[PDB]
From a paper:
The density of a representative bound cholesterol molecule is shown in the box. b, The ion-conducting pore in the apo (left) and Mg2+–ADPR-bound open (middle) states viewed parallel to the membrane, with plots of the pore radius along the pore axis (right). Before the onset of hydrolysis (substrate-bound state), both MHR1/2 and NUDT9-H domains are occupied by ADPR. Within NUDT9-H, the adenine group of ADPR is sandwiched by the indole group of W1264 and the phenyl group of F1372 via π–π stacking. Three Mg2+ cofactors (Mg1, Mg2 and Mg3) are bound between the two phosphate groups of ADPR and two acidic residues on the Nudix helix, E1386 and E1390. The extensive interactions between ADPR and the NUDT9-H domain strategically anchor both termini of the ADPR molecule, exposing only its α-phosphate (Pα) to solvent and making it readily accessible for nucleophilic attack. Indeed, we observed a putative water molecule bridging Mg2 and Mg3, as previously found in the crystal structure of NUDT5. On activation by Mg2+ ions, the water molecule is deprotonated by the catalytic base D1460 located in a loop close to the Nudix helix, and is poised for nucleophilic attack on the phosphorus atom of Pα.
We investigated a [name] from choanoflagellates that integrates two seemingly incompatible functions into a single peptide: a channel module activated by ADP-ribose with high open probability and an enzyme module (NUDT9-H domain) consuming ADP-ribose at a remarkably slow rate. Using time-resolved cryogenic-electron microscopy, we captured a complete series of structural snapshots of gating and catalytic cycles, revealing the coupling mechanism between channel gating and enzymatic activity. The slow kinetics of the NUDT9-H enzyme module confers a self-regulatory mechanism: ADPR binding triggers NUDT9-H tetramerization, promoting channel opening, while subsequent hydrolysis reduces local ADPR, inducing channel closure. The structures of srTRPM2 exhibit a characteristic [name] architecture, from top to bottom, a transmembrane domain (TMD) layer containing the ion-conducting pore, a signal transduction layer consisting of MHR3/4 domain and the C-terminal rib helix, and an ADPR-sensing layer consisting of the N-terminal MHR1/2 domain and the C-terminal NUDT9-H domain.
Author numbering:
A (entry chain B): 435 to 533, 547 to 756, 787 to 1157
B (entry chain A): 917 to 1061
C (entry chain A): 628 to 675
D (entry chain A): 1110 to 1157
């Protein structure tokens, strides 16, 4: 470089960089980058034959060079890349469910890998490729060189994240743009890659762990740049978090992060500030949970509530207070609480010989909830996303149970049997309703993380259920046969094997009842019996409760203790994710409570029929200007550079790095000392 | 007057901390207790007018069943099931679901919620255990003052 | 006395009423941390 | 007041002395000193 031989550097830099990528030497890839290594000027070693596909021919040379890497890595034994491509079940162009010579010779093309990674992130992530920017006619334009680098880097970035090479991935991440979003995408690909379907095996275990580790590192990156943003300009950082991105289908960054299950990104102050500001709306954050409830019950004493944000002020203040998501959450809680209390009263009180008034009110209420569930199904990202939530499963089961019970009662209201069967179904309804009421505990910092812990301990019970059945069924069959021999098998035998054995694990001993059933006539419980075999029941039981109450229950307590320590350490992260889910759910919620949401439903349906259809006049369009977009990109790159400089400075102050630096420096000091003594 | 002692003093502070842990437990249990109680009371005694006895019935057994005391003989007597096997020869088929609801309930209450509270207690003890000396010295000043 | 007063201001400042929000959490923690440092000072001089 | 100021000064001198005997501070001091040692070594070789 100093001696004017830059042309020779530029002539050999592409193949040398290519060789460095093939032989897994990241330090050499950085070294070359800056000395004019143009990532888009790569050339393949061999020449590809024509395949009569217009998409495959339109590709650039740098495009066949990312494939050759996949082929070289894939031909090695037990490579996860070949298994992933084979288990993807797609054709050469990446189209789903379409899997010859073309399918095997060009099985690792960049378009197909792009489709696999696109399907790997989410159902709506598309990276738009535009290879035309690599033509000589697009050269007089100023900023293209950046675009060509960024796109090229992105493709190499995806390749380096796949083979789990963090250092080369981080480097290519640095070369391109959209750093925060790319780090989240990288985290998502590594987490999904870590389980998938091909890597499930026991021997790949350490390997998948590595992936997870890499995953952690990339979100750490995603948090870090963001942090700089939060310490450079908070409002502009908030604008970045509210910004619609092109790769995902106009999803903001927090929604992308939630879809990528990045708990670290969601727990960050900037992200929490955006979610909290959206949560409280135009209400001062310092407003009591009590104050908003009282204001809900007393709307004309709400004028002195908190600093916010004649007719066009009082009306504006009412529309801002009742448009806030916090108020909607409080209204839904109270409303669901009345539903629980009123439905509980309805089930406890006797049914009349005709459909009563309270039954009609509950019928209107559950139709309204059914319409609200239908509204949630239409206005969402997908059916899978809706059905993923446990609360949606509980609300569908409660609506289904109520309608089965009502129709059971309503088929023949003047029937004693119909009332009894209907109340039996409505018992299940009240249990699921009170369980569904736990959704509103999630706002609290104590009550929220505990539900997540409860679903985790439900998983621990299932393991306990599998271990106990052995003892319960074995002891039950043995004990039931010893207590009542020479008796034909019936349903009572089946009820007898299961009833006592299960209830004896909770400390309730049926020894008086087992003494009565054994026909042992004596002051001492098992001596003067008709059969000598029944005297072994107290022994079997003696083994059984030692197995059940002392060993299995306490083993489950130990599993519970581990489960608590596990969800205890990330209780804050899980609460912050629930904070977003509350914020996201109540933004679209109509304000009116559940019985009265029919007026809101008919109002939205009337508005929907009127606007964005025939005879319409209302339409909204809010698109960000190009100037503010270029401001966010330059700001994001500057904060990316600031983080990495700060990160390097912080990493040089570590004990390991300082000891390493001190050791190498002393070795170099003795080299200089050897030179001195020679001079002397 | 236990506060002078180096063993007995820090334990009162720990007790007020575990009283705070109970309140959290009370909020979590009501869901199971009220739900199972309304469901079970309706299944045991159907077609009966609401009264104060209904309210006493929803709260009494469900709460005392979380301490290991099972009212199965009493629930068998109330279900009007006439048989050597406890729930077979009953007048109504709906009352045979009481042992099942209960089966879910005590799994939720005695095995999951009580042990979760024990885990909260263990954290609370480690928390007031490390600063037991500091809290005892503050109580020492409060006695002195 | 100033170190004790500093500790009191940081502990009261750490909760107060304005900093209650979820996003200020790391921030209030910092305050508590600072609080600890100042009483450490208050103890230390006293020790001498 | 004079006694308290004197003990404040004694604590801070003792605190600084204690903080210089920490592993992190000694490693940092050793690293900067070796860097300065090579600067002095560069000056020597030039003189030679
Ligand atoms: C998903 C969960 C919560 C719902 C479970 C389904 C419940 C509501 C259904 C499934 C099977 C049903 C039972 C099937 C048959 C009978 C016999 C009849 O003489 C009395 C009612 C009774 C005993 C039904 C009560 C309600 C019942 C238990
Ligand atoms: C390994 C463990 C968890 C086994 C699970 C225990 C379950 C399946 C057992 C334990 C107690 C059982 C109940 C005991 C008594 C009765 C009354 C009878 O008229 C109908 C069946 C019914 C309601 C049983 C249903 C099944 C039951 C709930
Ligand atoms: C290896 C393990 C299972 C230990 C084995 C111990 C078993 C076989 C022992 C322990 C208690 C024993 C019982 C104790 C007392 C009596 C009364 C006697 O008039 C007939 C035998 C009978 C009913 C015994 C049968 C064998 C018995 C069940
Ligand atoms: C230290 C502990 C574990 C002692 C072990 C307890 C064992 C040995 C005891 C506890 C309860 C006992 C049983 C109680 C009652 C009877 C009924 C009698 O007609 C035969 C013996 C038999 C079946 C006993 C066998 C021994 C027994 C199982
Ligand atoms: C998803 C969860 C709730 C599991 C569902 C299991 C429920 C629905 C099952 C388990 C035990 C069952 C009961 C067991 C036995 C009988 C006796 C029969 O003559 C009428 C039905 C009845 C009363 C059953 C009703 C349905 C029942 C309560
Ligand atoms: Mg960049
Ligand atoms: Mg829902």
């Amino acid at each position: 470089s100093k001696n004017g031989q830059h042309n020779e550097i530029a002539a050999c830099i592409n193949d040398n960089l290519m060789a460095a990528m093939m032989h897994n030497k990241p330090h050499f890839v950085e070294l070359y980058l800056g000395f004019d290594a143009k990532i888009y000027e790569l050339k393949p070693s061999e020449e590809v034959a024509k395949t009569n596909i217009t998409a495959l021919d339109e590709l650039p040379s740098f495009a066949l060079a990312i494939e050759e890497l996949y082929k070289r890595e894939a031909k090695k034994p037990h490579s996860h890349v070949q298994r992933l491509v084979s288990l993807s079940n797609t054709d050469v162009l990446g189209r789903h469910y379409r899997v010859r010579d073309l399918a095997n010779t060009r099985a690792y093309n960049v378009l197909r890998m792009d489709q696999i990674f696109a399907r790997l992130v989410s159902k709506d992530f598309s990276v738009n490729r535009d290879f035309t920017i690599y033509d000589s006619k697009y050269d007089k334009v100023p900023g293209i060189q950046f675009r060509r680098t960024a796109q090229a880097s992105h493709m190499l970035f995806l390749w380096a994240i796949c083979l789990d090479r963090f250092r080369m991935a981080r480097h290519f991440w640095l070369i391109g743009d959209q750093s925060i979003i790319n780090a989240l995408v990288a985290s998502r690909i590594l987490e999904r890659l870590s389980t998938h379907r091909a890597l499930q095996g026991p021997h790949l275990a350490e390997e998948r762990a590595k992936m997870q580790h890499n995953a952690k590192k990339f979100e750490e990156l995603a948090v870090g740049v963001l942090g700089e943003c939060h310490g450079s300009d908070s409002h502009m950082a908030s604008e970045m978090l509210h910004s619609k991105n092109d790769m995902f289908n106009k999803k903001n960054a927090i929604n992308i992060a939630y879809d990528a299950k990045s708990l670290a990104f969601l727990s960050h102050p900037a992200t929490q500030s955006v979610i909290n500001a959206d949560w409280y709306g135009h209400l001062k954050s310092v407003t009591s949970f009590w104050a908003v409830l009282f204001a809900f019950f007393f709307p004309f004493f709400v004028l002195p509530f908190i600093n916010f944000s004649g007719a066009h002020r009082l009306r504006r203040k009412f529309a801002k207070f009742y448009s806030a998501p916090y108020t909607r959450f409080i209204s839904d809680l109270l409303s669901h609480f009345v539903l629980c209390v009123v439905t509980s009263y309805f089930v406890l009180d006797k049914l009349e010989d005709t459909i009563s008034a309270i039954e009609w009110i509950l019928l209107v209420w559950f139709v309204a909830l059914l319409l609200e569930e239908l509204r949630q199904m239409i206005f969402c990202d997908g059916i899978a996303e809706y059905i993923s939530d446990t609360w949606n499963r509980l609300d569908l089961i409660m609506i289904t149970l109520f309608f089965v019970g009502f129709f059971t009662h309503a088929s023949d209201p003047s029937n004693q049997d119909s009332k009894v069967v209907s109340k039996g179904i409505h018992a299940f309804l009240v249990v699921v309703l009170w369980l569904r009421f736990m959704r509103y505990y999630a706002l609290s910092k104590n009550l929220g993380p505990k539900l997540i812990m409860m679903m985790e301990m439900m998983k621990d019970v299932s393991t306990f259920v599998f271990l106990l059945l052995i003892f319960l069924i074995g002891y039950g069959v043995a004990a039931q046969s010893l207590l009542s021999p020479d008796e034909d098998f019936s349903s009572r035998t089946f009820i007898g094997v299961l009833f006592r054995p299960y209830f004896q694990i909770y400390g309730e001993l049926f020894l008086d009842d087992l003494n009565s059933e054994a026909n042992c006539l004596g002051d001492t419980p098992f001596t003067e019996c008709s059969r000598e075999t029944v005297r072994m029941v107290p022994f079997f039981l003696a083994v059984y409760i030692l197995g059940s109450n002392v060993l299995l229950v306490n083993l489950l307590i130990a599993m519970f203790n581990d489960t608590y320590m596990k969800v205890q350490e990330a209780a804050e992260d899980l609460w912050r994710k629930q904070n977003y889910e509350l914020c996201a759910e109540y933004k679209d919620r109509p304000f009116l409570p559940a019985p009265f949401i029919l007026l809101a439903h008919v109002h939205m349906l009337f508005m929907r029929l009127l606007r964005l259809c025939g005879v319409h006049t209302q339409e909204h369009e809010k698109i960000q200007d190009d100037e503010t977009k270029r401001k966010i990109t330059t700001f994001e790159e500057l904060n990316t550079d600031k983080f990495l400089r700060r990160w390097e400075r912080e990493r040089q102050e570590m004990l390991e790095a300082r000891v390493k630096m001190t050791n190498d420096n002393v070795v170099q000091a003795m080299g200089m000392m050897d030179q001195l003594l020679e001079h002397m």
